[PDB]
Symmetry: C4
Subunit: 380 residues, 4 copies
């Protein structure tokens, strides 16, 4: 997990959302030290347990209410329970990752500090800060707007089904912890995306530096510069492995949540389209499909970008080999090419799957198969 000064806003958002239980004090040199915050550690554990219990308490209350709002039919009960369960597993995995990844966070940030020093010619504090804040603001605004629309639509649905001998508005009011869990999930995805995007961006900066220093006395300094670039590439690969080892189960549960959410929400959209009972509900479900697809991209694209940027470095080095003539420089380029021969670039979610754009194709095939099967389920 990355905590830098440009992206300190994302870290604060994750910290208040029980995902980054670390206390950071900025040094006079601009470097950010990281240490365990036991106050926020117990706060994160307590908040996760309490709000997960509250979310399931509201689920049971809706199921045991006089007039259920969401847990009405057996199919609706199973779909709603699964919808809550995937969010709960994703946020719990994210909090667990944040609690037990302090050492890997320290190693990742130390390596990133060294890499940033190496690539100081391509650092942009303003652009990085605005990109990080923009991504966090857009994600939080999107989830806030969709939560407001969803709660309003469900409040209207509850009012329509309301009977004078029971209250249905409180049933919608008891789903507030579920939407707060959605906020925690959004913060966790923003934090993971920020770290993975930073790794891919630094890989791209390394490739740009290689091409700008080797394809567009002095030879000793140039060889030292190439040695620094090779060390930075190896360190960036280790950083990718650190992020995978720390948040692999979180990414895996995010992917599972995205798959189940897309299938279930599309199935509900088909049911409402067949019934044609409400139009605003259809638009809200379409927005939910967009949100789930966007967060799937937000977890998939950064890993694919990092892998691609890290895998084109060997082609750049091959060109450098075809262009180098100096003995010590050619030996250094040979060492770099040998290192790049066996680099493990792809992001792995605990070894279950490799996180790249191929996951999108697998997700699309699985969504189509399960959706069609559910249609046959409904007709029968």
């Amino acid at each position: 997990m990355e905590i830098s000064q440009p992206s300190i806003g994302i870290f604060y958002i994750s910290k208040v959302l029980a995902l980054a239980p670390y206390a950071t004090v900025r040094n006079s040199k601009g470097r950010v030290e990281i240490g365990r915050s036991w106050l926020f550690t117990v706060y994160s554990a307590t908040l996760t347990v309490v709000m997960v219990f509250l979310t399931y308490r509201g689920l049971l209350f809706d199921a045991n209410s006089e007039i259920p709002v969401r847990m009405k039919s057996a199919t609706s009960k199973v779909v709603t329970a699964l919808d809550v369960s995937v969010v709960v597993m994703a946020i719990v995995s994210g909090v667990y990752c944040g609690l037990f990844s302090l050492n890997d966070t320290l190693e990742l940030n130390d390596r990133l500090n060294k890499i940033d020093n190496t690539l100081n010619a391509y650092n942009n504090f303003r652009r990085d800060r605005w990109r990080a804040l923009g991504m966090a603001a857009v994600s939080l605004l999107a989830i806030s707007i969709l939560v407001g629309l969803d709660v309003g639509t469900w409040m209207r649905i509850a009012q329509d089904m309301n009977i004078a001998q029971s209250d249905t508005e409180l049933n919608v009011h008891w789903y507030i912890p579920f939407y707060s869990l959605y906020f925690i999930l959004t913060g966790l995805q923003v934090n993971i995306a920020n770290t993975a995007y930073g790794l891919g961006r630094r890989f791209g900066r390394l490739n740009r530096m290689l091409s700008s220093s080797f394809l567009a006395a002095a030879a000793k300094n140039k060889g030292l510069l190439l040695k620094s670039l090779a060390d930075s590439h190896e360190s960036l690969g280790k950083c990718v492995h650190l992020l995978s080892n720390s948040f692999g189960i979180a990414v895996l549960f995010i992917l599972v949540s995205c798959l189940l959410h897309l299938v279930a929400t599309a199935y509900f959209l088909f049911l409402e389209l067949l019934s044609k009972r409400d139009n605003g509900y259809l638009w809200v479900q379409m927005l939910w499909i967009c949100f789930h697809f966007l967060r799937l991209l937000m977890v998939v694209e950064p890993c694919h970008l990092a892998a691609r940027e890290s895998r084109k470095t060997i082609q750049i080095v091959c060109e450098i080999e075809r262009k180098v003539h100096e003995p010590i420089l050619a030996e250094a380029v040979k060492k770099f090419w040998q290192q790049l021969l066996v680099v493990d670039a792809d992001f792995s979610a605990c070894g279950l799957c490799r996180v790249n754009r191929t996951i999108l194709t697998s997700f699309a095939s699985a969504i189509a198969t399960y959706l069609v099967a559910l249609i046959q389920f409904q007709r029968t």
Copy 2:
């Protein structure tokens, strides 16, 4: 995207079909310069928007007509809407690719000019021109014939269902923009196939030159020739990457269109075969299956051929290593083998999938699964 003098006819076809908004003036040396044509740029954007709007306007008109011809049943409505949607996405992606790939087109054609100069012993202007014109003519003739047959069959179907209190012929007449979109899709596929086939053909010419110059004073010239061949192979690989980066989303949407078209048309053929209501409709649907399979091959085969031709070069170089004895020549062959160790050969459609003949197996499995599921859908 390739624009050469032998294949200038395909470029003109793509230009009038809103896919190649580039102005090319032939030099006195025979080289074709390429520049943005703002007249054809705005023409391509305007034509795409206008005819897409007209196609969907005709779709809505058919759905809102007194007697619908194609949008009759809910299953028919969904299938017809999806049939129009995949064509619209494919042609829009192709036009978008053609609008924002001028720089990559310039780089690809510059590299191809250098490669053609290197392999001038294997260039055949007459054969290349006739192959390109033949492929374009066959594709345009096939789509023209199938459009005429489809509109005639649908006109007959509309006449059979016609009632004196409504007009059904105009419903078929409003599907003309959809068939024009089919023409644009055919032109886009011809352009992509021409570029990819040219890359694979040049890879094969490079392999032939390697085998004819190294397996069947002077040594310095021979080593320079091998250096040119190695540079040509690297440039051809970069050309494949340029084509993938420029038209990857177009190829991906073409593949999606082919998959959906094959599944939907086969499902309609099964429905008509079960009903046994019309025989000419069955033959037209069979021709549509042939056309969709042929265009799937036309987008899949060139990429597979390019990958295979580029991947056998390393075996040829290994034989050259086993046959070479000259010091400078052996060093050059060693450099070539090292370069060929890490070549990225497969064509990638935005990283979603690798375009080769394995896609055919995946398509066949997916088609069988979805088709059988649709049969169970219809029986229920």
Copy 3:
């Protein structure tokens, strides 16, 4: 396609079955020359066309008879037509491969002669001849027995359904060309399996020779021996590619036939088990499942064995590197290791799929999916 003196019996079986239209005259040196036999070329083409036409004529006759025996229900009609179609495509592809693979056959046999000369210490004429004749005899005996059982069972079924106003025995008698096509398919599979098994066996002999000559004046001869082994390995890989290029579509259609046959026969076995109408039919269908699984193994196992044997050579060479000290010998082993780094070992069926034991897992998954879907089809 391999035609050697030990396996000349398999070649004669394939020749009389319209699969090997080659005229071979044995030399005084024991080498078998191969040339096109226009008499057997036109015989193969004529026999294939005639018996394919007869098989489909009998299919149409059964469908148009007063009391159909196999083409009774629409589901039965589709299953029986597909059962005939896969056999027809497989045998036609095999005959087409045999007609247009004379040059590759010549190259493969020339390479195999050189390899056999290199590995003459491990050649066993008696064992190879008895293995080839045993495989051919077992396959022909199995298909003969199953054809007799199938025709007897169908004759009994026709007699049970017989009505005095029609003849049903002639309906079974018109399926004789279909069973002859099964014989041609068995011969084609035997020929392909013999060639692929020979390639894998020679790979294993090469590995044994490497381990027995390098792991268990003189150094110059030993280096020459290693050069011969490296050339033999490269030639064996080219032989695998020759077999793939010649009979890839035949192997692909054999795999398609095996998949469709297993699914359809298992579905019919489930139908008969549900009906419990006949027990001998159930046993015959179980034998057909065994036969289709065995021929699937007969086409899959040899390719997997060849790939495994060719892929363990690099490990043997790595051990030789760790054991070699002589300068020229170490250089030769380095060249061999470099060659083995980039060997294309897996058998490819026209690039559609890689033929190994992974195909068995894919087949099992596909069979389970389609079978379960067909069960839901039948219940509905």
Copy 4:
């Protein structure tokens, strides 16, 4: 198969469970010699045949009883028969593997003795013994508890359905051989997991030794130490191949058993949940799901761990290359890197599939697909 002094308890458990028919006498040096035990060889074969026959005899008795307990409905009959069949195939494959893997067991233990001598600094007799005994005790306790719960639940179900004119308790009493087969399966899985975990643990110890001796006169000894580490890594890879060649079909049938068990038990849990007839049965089925998932992990995780540990050695060696300067030491590290370039690390179950955590994803997808299809089967 591994038989060491720390893990001698697992060997004894496997020996009394007809899985390790080997007689071992401990030497005065602490080394364990292994030889065929014909008494236990015939005991293993006789016990396997007898109890398999008894399990199927009880299955037939339940099917032919007046009031069947488990083989009541046709769906129940098929599910129960498949449940018994997968266990029978798994235990039979395990016994067959144990009977015909004496030579590979000898080779594996000789190699492991050499590796343990090489890595004697990281051997922990107490920790290894307690880990092996703990894993065996936990697995046996879990299967014992679940067998007791399952037999008690089925006894209660039989008592509820009991009619005065028949006995149903004996029907449950005749399923005792099936539960004994479950015990044999648990012992076989413990033995396989112990061997695979030992291989992965030794790979990790080798990586730790490499990092502690090369990253944290004398140079000759250090080079000899690296040569020993390289030999140990190659020997560990050969040990993984020995385990795969010996117990590949056993692992494959264990995977098939796990897949079928998870699908069938989940389907029965869904049926009972829909019926809501018994709650204790639901809890027992949930425990069975946990047990099948845990044994799937117990067969999948060790292979994935071994592959990962063996695949990070090349990265460690790359760092050593970047840190080494001594000529003979650098040459030794170059040899080690060359060896690690082409290491076959993944565990293969007879080539059908590669055993790693990707199997979990494939299993999850297959389970979801078959389960949903079975739900549609039940509703229809």
